[PDB]
Amino acid sequence: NPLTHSTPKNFGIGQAVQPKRNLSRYVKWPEYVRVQRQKKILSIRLKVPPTIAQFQYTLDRNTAAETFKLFNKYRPETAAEKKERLTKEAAAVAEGKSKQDASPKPYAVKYGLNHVVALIENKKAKLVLIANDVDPIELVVFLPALCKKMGVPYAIVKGKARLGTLVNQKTSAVAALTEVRAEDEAALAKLVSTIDANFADKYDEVKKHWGGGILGNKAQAKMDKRAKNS
Amino acid sequence: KALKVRTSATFRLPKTLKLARAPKYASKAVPHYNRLDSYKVIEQPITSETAMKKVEDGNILVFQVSMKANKYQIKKAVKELYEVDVLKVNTLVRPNGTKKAYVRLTADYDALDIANRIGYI
Amino acid sequence: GAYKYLEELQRKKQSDVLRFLQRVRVWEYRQKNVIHRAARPTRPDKARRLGYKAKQGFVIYRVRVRRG
Amino acid sequence: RPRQYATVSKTHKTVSRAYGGSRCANCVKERIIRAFLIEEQKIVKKVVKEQTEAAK
Amino acid sequence: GRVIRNQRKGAGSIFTSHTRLRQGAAKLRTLDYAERHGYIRGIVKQIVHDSGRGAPLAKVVFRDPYKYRLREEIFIANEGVHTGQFIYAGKKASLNVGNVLPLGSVPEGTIVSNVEEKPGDRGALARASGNYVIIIGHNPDENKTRVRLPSGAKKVISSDARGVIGVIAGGGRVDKPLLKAGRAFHKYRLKRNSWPKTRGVAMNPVDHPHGGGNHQHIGKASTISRGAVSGQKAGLIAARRTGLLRG
RNA sequence: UUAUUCAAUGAAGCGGAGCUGGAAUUCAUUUUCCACGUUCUAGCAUUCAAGGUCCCAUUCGGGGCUGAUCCGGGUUGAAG
RNA sequence: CUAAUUAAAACAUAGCAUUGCGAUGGUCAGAAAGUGAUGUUGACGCAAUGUGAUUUCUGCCCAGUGCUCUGAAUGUCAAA
RNA sequence: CGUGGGUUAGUCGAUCCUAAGAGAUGGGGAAGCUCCGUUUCAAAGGCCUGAUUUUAUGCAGGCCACCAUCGAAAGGGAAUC
Numbered sequence A: 001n002p003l004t005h006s007t008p009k010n011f012g013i014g015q016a017v018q019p020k021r022n023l024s025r026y027v028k029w030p031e032y033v034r035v036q037r038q039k040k041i042l043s044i045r046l047k048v049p050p051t052i053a054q055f056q057y058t059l060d061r062n063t064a065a066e067t068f069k070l071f072n073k074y075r076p077e078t079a080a081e082k083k084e085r086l087t088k089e090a091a092a093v094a095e096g097k098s099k100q101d102a103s104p105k106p107y108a109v110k111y112g113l114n115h116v117v118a119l120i121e122n123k124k125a126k127l128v129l130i131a132n133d134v135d136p137i138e139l140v141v142f143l144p145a146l147c148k149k150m151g152v153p154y155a156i157v158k159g160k161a162r163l164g165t166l167v168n169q170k171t172s173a174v175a176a177l178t179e180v181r182a183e184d185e186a187a188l189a190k191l192v193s194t195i196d197a198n199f200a201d202k203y204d205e206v207k208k209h210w211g212g213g214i215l216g217n218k219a220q221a222k223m224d225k226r227a228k229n230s
Numbered sequence B: 001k002a003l004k005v006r007t008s009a010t011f012r013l014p015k016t017l018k019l020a021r022a023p024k025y026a027s028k029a030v031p032h033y034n035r036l037d038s039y040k041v042i043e044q045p046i047t048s049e050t051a052m053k054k055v056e057d058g059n060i061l062v063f064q065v066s067m068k069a070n071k072y073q074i075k076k077a078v079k080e081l082y083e084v085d086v087l088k089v090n091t092l093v094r095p096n097g098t099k100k101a102y103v104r105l106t107a108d109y110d111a112l113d114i115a116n117r118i119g120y121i
Numbered sequence C: 001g002a003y004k005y006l007e008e009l010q011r012k013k014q015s016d017v018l019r020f021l022q023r024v025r026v027w028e029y030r031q032k033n034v035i036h037r038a039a040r041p042t043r044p045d046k047a048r049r050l051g052y053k054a055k056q057g058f059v060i061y062r063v064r065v066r067r068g
Numbered sequence D: 001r002p003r004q005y006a007t008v009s010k011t012h013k014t015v016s017r018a019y020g021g022s023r024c025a026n027c028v029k030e031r032i033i034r035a036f037l038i039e040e041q042k043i044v045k046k047v048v049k050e051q052t053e054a055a056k
Numbered sequence E: 001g002r003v004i005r006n007q008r009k010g011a012g013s014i015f016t017s018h019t020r021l022r023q024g025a026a027k028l029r030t031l032d033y034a035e036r037h038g039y040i041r042g043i044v045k046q047i048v049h050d051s052g053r054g055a056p057l058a059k060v061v062f063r064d065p066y067k068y069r070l071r072e073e074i075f076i077a078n079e080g081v082h083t084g085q086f087i088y089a090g091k092k093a094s095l096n097v098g099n100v101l102p103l104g105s106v107p108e109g110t111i112v113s114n115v116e117e118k119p120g121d122r123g124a125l126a127r128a129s130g131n132y133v134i135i136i137g138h139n140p141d142e143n144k145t146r147v148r149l150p151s152g153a154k155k156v157i158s159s160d161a162r163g164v165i166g167v168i169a170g171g172g173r174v175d176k177p178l179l180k181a182g183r184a185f186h187k188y189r190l191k192r193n194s195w196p197k198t199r200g201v202a203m204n205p206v207d208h209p210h211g212g213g214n215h216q217h218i219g220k221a222s223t224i225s226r227g228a229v230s231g232q233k234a235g236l237i238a239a240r241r242t243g244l245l246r247g
Numbered sequence F: 001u002u003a004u005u006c007a008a009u010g011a012a013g014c015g016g017a018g019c020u021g022g023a024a025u026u027c028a029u030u031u032u033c034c035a036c037g038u039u040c041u042a043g044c045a046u047u048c049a050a051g052g053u054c055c056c057a058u059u060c061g062g063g064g065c066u067g068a069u070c071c072g073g074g075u076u077g078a079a080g
Numbered sequence G: 001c002u003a004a005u006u007a008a009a010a011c012a013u014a015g016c017a018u019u020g021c022g023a024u025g026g027u028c029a030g031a032a033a034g035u036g037a038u039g040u041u042g043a044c045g046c047a048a049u050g051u052g053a054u055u056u057c058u059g060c061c062c063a064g065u066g067c068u069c070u071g072a073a074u075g076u077c078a079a080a
Numbered sequence H: 001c002g003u004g005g006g007u008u009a010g011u012c013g014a015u016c017c018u019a020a021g022a023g024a025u026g027g028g029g030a031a032g033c034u035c036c037g038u039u040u041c042a043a044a045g046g047c048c049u050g051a052u053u054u055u056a057u058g059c060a061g062g063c064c065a066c067c068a069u070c071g072a073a074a075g076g077g078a079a080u081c
């Protein structure tokens, strides 16, 4: 096309004004966006003592898929099925009158931090799921030591949001199974086998290993320049 | 993980939805009436001999008006009270703190007839 | 319950656990305002014994004042 | 006076050239010469630079 | 028992800078990618006079790299800089008078002015009229450079700090005598209220530590410690030797 | 270096890794380093960039990619 | 310049000289401060003083007291 | 002294602009009355769409990086003889 021509621009220094490049690296973020990024940085800069970052070894994606597959079968009552089952328990008063036992034993997961800590202490829990992301971590940071001492298998899992999903909350921070249905006993057992393989059996070694000290990209890539030049 | 291309280093506040008010009760429940109607604008004629010299000679109706009335509210009130048309309004605040309006009518009307039609001279 | 463990561990201020947690948190509180709303108590157990309950009406403000 | 220029028409405010009411017909003519003599210099400085790096 | 004139100056009431007629802050161009990896070309459009300053100001106009607009920086004019002159600022720039280059990328014995004490603070050294900076050394590992300041002192500045080649224009100004209190009056009219000066020995003891007595005499030693405070630092502060320089 | 301290900016190009050519006498290995689109002149430089490429559902117009290397989201330099 | 008893030889002055300071600074503010003046500054500058245009000179003194010194390191040396 | 009359503006001023300055906000200090600061270390925002039938003109593009306000009846300023 003889009408159309090729300009090409000289985007060098001191010539031909710069184009609209991406400066997402260079945004002055709002003050909260800096502090929520630099807090995560400052955690992994310092030497994290092993009582923290005995977290961040998390039940991985394939075996946390199995864990939530089992725990979703034992989901607690909603308000929808509770208001229904009280009406059938109303009919227990109306005509049932066993004593008050129109309803069977409910098999549900056990949640709530005070409840679950008390369930571990009486050694009634069969498996505990611990959220890694809770804040303040002081709420949960004693839980692996307690679970190790009472002999309850525990998993540090990702998501207090996800633990809240199976208990119909928004956040749960713990989720325990204290008894399963008899058809799911082998399902729990192979989970218990791998979860102690990842968490409880390493616990005596994880207790010694500090965390953090991870340097940033520039200062890491300047550290190996000093190593190669010396 | 992709991310949005940000051509500006400046982060501005986003444009959130600003809902309108939808109140559960009225603020005052009875609107005030017209705080300056025609009877509040025009109070009385000014009936000095100097104001009477302007009735025939100049075709000006001299009034005493509210201090809160501007030259639009004087013109509007004079028109629909006295069924005239105003050519011009000149207004002064008198040294007794009252507002005096020189209201000149258009040539179709005669301020001498209208002065008798109001009732003064 | 869990608040008994929270109560005793909070007494171990110079423990290696809390000395890290105090270091990370004291940095975060300087990058906020001098007076600013806390979303929830950093010490829920200390909030119970002083009077706080988790219901609508209870408000936490974190605040720093100059020593000396 | 500077607000009177909004009352008069465009003929009083501009000469019929490029850069009419801005520059002064000698600064414009010098601007046209200085424009022209540099791309002809730039074309020459391009073929001088390209040839001398094509050698070695 | 009354606060002295040297103490009252810090309140900054009538003792401020008379800064209405001044042309701006005479700084360097802000250190950016143009001046850190290549150069940028300016143009002098005015050599103007700065009120209260004995050195002319060069208004140098650059193009903004990122937006289509013109940015007018205000330089202190170097002796030899003219109007219509292209001015180069950057690292790859050429040594001419009025060009702005880092101290590392100019050789030994180069004469520079408007020299940054820290890289990017837009000019701090050699800014009064006639003064200059000589580069007397280099330490290329851990990049530094040794200079001679206009006082005669030796300073070590980063090699990424900048400077403008040449002396600051307007030199030889103080070599002219003022001849009269009037020409002192209008020099300090456009600077600040420090003129005239009443001698402290010409005072009452309430006003100055030197005043009073039946004869105008100092009374105590005029040399005072650095370890004194306001109201006692009226004289020679922390002097090493006094009087003439005759050994 | 992450607390702290100094400073600068519309937080715009930082760090690392990638094309060449050699007085690397390639030592069949970047033990290795260097230069990154602009300097006769008081001009001009803006419309997501023309070009190229591919798609649309083509609507006379619209969207990507490349032009303009990739990755790390550490704004950058000090001081500790 | 002593309004309203002192207009002077007193104050100022240019000239001269001394002193401190290269900015993390000198001199000074402020109760503090993410605080100020000089400072829209940078030694031909700023600040602190002394003498007071020009001619011609500024002798002797470091024992005293002040000021100052990368100066001597079991004389004295508080708290921890 | 007693009683009244009298001051009419699009064009004259105020109003608007900034000056030296004063002074909120964000934020820091201070037991506090309040102090500092006036662009700061803030997520600080309105401007036109080319031009209208799915338009109370947006539920869209697109543009803009500054950041209160007060401060002159002698300064600047639309226009009457």
Ligand SMILES: [Mg+2]
Residues within 6 Å of the ligand: A038, A039, A041, A042
């Ligand atoms: Mg941090």
Ligand SMILES: [Mg+2]
Residues within 6 Å of the ligand: B091, B092, B093, B094
């Ligand atoms: Mg009036």
Ligand SMILES: [Mg+2]
Residues within 6 Å of the ligand: B091, B092
């Ligand atoms: Mg009037």
Ligand SMILES: [Mg+2]
Residues within 6 Å of the ligand: E197, E198, E199
């Ligand atoms: Mg004097």
Ligand SMILES: [Mg+2]
Residues within 6 Å of the ligand: E202, E203, E204
């Ligand atoms: Mg006296």
Ligand SMILES: [Mg+2]
Residues within 6 Å of the ligand: F009, F011, F075
């Ligand atoms: Mg920047």
Ligand SMILES: [Mg+2]
Residues within 6 Å of the ligand: none
């Ligand atoms: Mg007298």
Ligand SMILES: [Mg+2]
Residues within 6 Å of the ligand: none
């Ligand atoms: Mg100031």
Ligand SMILES: [Mg+2]
Residues within 6 Å of the ligand: G058
């Ligand atoms: Mg002598």
Ligand SMILES: [Mg+2]
Residues within 6 Å of the ligand: G078, G079
């Ligand atoms: Mg002791």
Ligand SMILES: [Mg+2]
Residues within 6 Å of the ligand: none
């Ligand atoms: Mg009278």
Ligand SMILES: [Mg+2]
Residues within 6 Å of the ligand: none
């Ligand atoms: Mg007028």
Ligand SMILES: [Mg+2]
Residues within 6 Å of the ligand: none
């Ligand atoms: Mg205004």
Ligand SMILES: [Mg+2]
Residues within 6 Å of the ligand: none
């Ligand atoms: Mg105003």
Ligand SMILES: [Mg+2]
Residues within 6 Å of the ligand: H075
């Ligand atoms: Mg004027």
